[PDB]
């Protein structure tokens, strides 16, 4: 019909093989091997499906090359804060672990040298060398970590100043031609909305903020950097209290009596700051993510069937006279066709819920006694649920009780859709396997004669999709009855491919005229050996159980009597 | 102790912003709402037809 | 022989003093595609006499 094709796109293959060989490449990105025995038991190499990636985003992530201070003793302590004000920070990148803390102003006029403050214990383990290296063009502070302190209470504010764009460092070649300058001069602003390093929010600042002012300070901050050296400097230069606004953006003055005395004697001192670096890589220190392609292979084959057979006497012509070949085609059609195709339907949908479970994914590679392929390009998941038309419903006076029939099935099927998307993310893959084409995802929804009356509702043409493209299909087995199938399906593609649902390998059978002897009787017997299978890739399905539906719709000539014969008033 | 070819991807690109405007809709709940779509508690009606 | 479970890992089981100043083992270590089974040894054995 259209139901059998929608679901299984037909495949002409050449009659000079057993079937189809199937070729799947694989991008999967490397961590590291899980164990060396020395009792020569296996290794295993941890690989991970980049196309999982689409889903999350921590399973790929890199930080090979920023530039981050570590915390030695005796080596650079008197380059750091005083770690009584701010303990120690714990960071991971790559596979080092260590300590970091922010960069104390240096106002006593010696500078630093970035490269020795950020080589990091890999760095050590690959030797002990920062001089061929080079740092980026792009440098910018992270944060500013400012003092608020009054009588002894002290408050800190992890300020993301890297979002400001007077915050970069930019090239004056005036005394060298690899030097670049800072100046950061403006105001920063602490809301009502400010929280300490710790999460909390602000103490001293309460008063204010609890009034609903705003409270900004001037920021002057100077320095210089060289990339080719790993010389350079950066200096407080000027910070203080500078205005007080409203709510109404109104701008109140420092003197008023109800800011002044919550202003006065706090002392905004600035205490460390920290840097954007990024080296270079020009002389290829550091090797990224490693990604490495496996291929995976499977072949599919076809079987042959038991025939079909046609009686018919010998002597004269086969051509013009008695049972044609008309007869032959149609119950190959109606036969092979249809009932095989529902019955590998309904047998894959069984076979899903047995091995899969219900409402449970699972990650990208699974258990492999599911055929298909799809299974290492999306989540395998499985889901059915089962309405209850006459126990969900209730309407007695005939009227709308079919558009709430409808608006029954719409919202089952669109939140078992969208939901089943969701835990699959099949758009992503989509998305991710074509380059220069990527059609809205395709649902078919086929099912029974009697239900298509729901399944749209009245007064639109965006049925059963908002993102989506649907095609409604009918079939007349006894076996679907009352219930819907649901599943992903391509219709441009024509060719058998991992986000294809299903192929019918399709190999055609010539019939066979000769002379045959049966029981003692000359007879002719026209012949053919059919040869076709349908194959299965996607394991996503979605199944709806619809029972009691004769009930409710009983239920509209079911209603008590409602008449109401009173006199004509006007 | 190794003999290799390197093929290198060196990304340059950032995201940067001009609107100061924006805003969110946070939304919770919505599965047990959906739920209570099968929660309901049953009323049938089934009685002798009427005509 | 192998068992119900567990194989043999050939590569590092053959792990030479000899190897060991390269590093255990790489990406670059690939076998030859002649793989023979070099000497199969089997056992007649009488009343617990064992002849190889």
Known sequence: HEFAELFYRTYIVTPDQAGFQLS?????????WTGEGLSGEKQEISKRNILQGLLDYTTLETNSTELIPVIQSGENDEQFIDPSVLP?????????????????FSENGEGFNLLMLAQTPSRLKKGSMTFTDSLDSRIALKQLLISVTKGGTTELFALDVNRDQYAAYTATREYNFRLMQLKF??????????????????????????????????????????????????????????????????????????????????????????????????????MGLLIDSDVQKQGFMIPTLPPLV????????????????????????????????????????????????????????????????????????????????????????????????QGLIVSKINEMVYTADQLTGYTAALEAAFSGRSPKPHVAIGTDMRLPQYIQINGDDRTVGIGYDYTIARISDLRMKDKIVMTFILPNESE?????????????????????IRNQRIGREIRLTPRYRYFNF???????????????????????????????AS
């Not at 991992?498 to 390998?505: A, F, I, S």
């Not at 409710?552 to 079911?558: F, Y």
Request: glycine letters at 8%; aromatic letters at 6%.
């Open 24 to 32: 799947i490449r694989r991008n999967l990105v490397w961590e590291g």
């Open 88 to 104: 120690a920070q714990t960071v991971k990148q790559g596979k080092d672990t260590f300590d970091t803390n922010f960069l104390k």
């Open 185 to 286: 001069h403006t105001s920063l602003g602490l809301g009502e909305e400010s929280t300490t390093v710790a999460g909390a929010e602000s103490a001293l600042l309460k008063d204010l903020f609890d009034l609903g002012y705003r409270i900004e300070l001037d920021v002057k901050v100077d320095g210089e950097m060289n990339v080719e050296n790993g010389n350079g400097d950066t200096s407080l230069r000027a910070l203080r209290l500078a205005r007080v606004f409203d709510k109404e953006g109104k701008e109140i003055a420092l003197t008023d009596s109800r800011v002044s005395a919550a202003l006065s004697g706090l002392t905004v001192t600035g205490v460390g700051y920290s840097l954007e670096a990024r080296l270079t890589n020009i002389n290829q220190l550091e």
């Open 310 to 405: 046609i009686v018919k006497p010998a002597m004269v012509e086969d051509d013009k006279t008695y049972p044609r070949l008309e007869a032959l085609t149609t119950a190959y059609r109606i036969q092979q066709m249809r009932n095989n195709a529902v019955t590998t339907l309904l047998n894959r949908a069984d076979t899903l819920k047995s091995y899969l479970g219900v409402g449970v994914p699972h990650p990208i590679e699974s258990n492999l006694g599911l055929e298909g392929v799809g299974q290492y390009y999306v989540r395998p998941y499985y889901n059915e649920a089962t309405i209850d038309v006459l126990n969900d419903l209730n309407n007695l006076t005939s009227a709308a009780k079919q558009t709430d029939i």
């Open 496 to 516: 058998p491919h991992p986000l294809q649902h299903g192929v019918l390998g399709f190999i055609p059978e010539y019939l066979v005229d000769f002379n045959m």
């Open 538 to 568: 996607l394991p996503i399905m979605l199944v709806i159980n619809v029972i009691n539906l004769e009930e409710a719709i009983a239920q509209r000539t079911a209603l008590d009597v409602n008449e109401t014969q009173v006199t004509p």
